Amino acid sequence: STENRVIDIVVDEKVPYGLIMQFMDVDDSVYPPSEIPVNLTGYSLRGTIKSSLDENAETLASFTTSIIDAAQGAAAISLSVADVTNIGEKASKERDKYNPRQRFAGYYDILMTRDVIGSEVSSFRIMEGKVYISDGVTQ
């Protein structure tokens, strides 16, 4: 299927954020294709948000990251409320005509590494996109 690496994100103001993800290897040599939980031992995650692709563009936040269930391929990433406030302050005023509650805020990437074999490491850009803040009237 389509090799989509790209997903946009919608955080919400005044509220902490968290995302969980589950890794499965799928083999289509036999039908229907077989889906298997990835043993997530020894992997690690990073990622950062900044206001533009530019090489000088300032960082707005970085993710807290943790493994959740290594035998089940579960991991999670999150942002504290203070980070969310910084996003909301820095973000655009411009609104979006499809949903006026959303405001553009920056670009993100959750670069992931494996260090499992031979004590030597490798890294790849598993997921990428834009991030928006949704406004909230409840404080």
């Binding site: 389509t2 989509n4 790209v6 997903i7 946009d8 005509k97 499809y98 996109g129």
Partner: peptide
């Protein structure tokens, strides 16, 4: 009036 959009996983 408004213009159409098509998308997949936000692409």
């Amino acid at each position: 009036y408004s213009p159409v959009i098509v998308s997949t996983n936000g692409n």
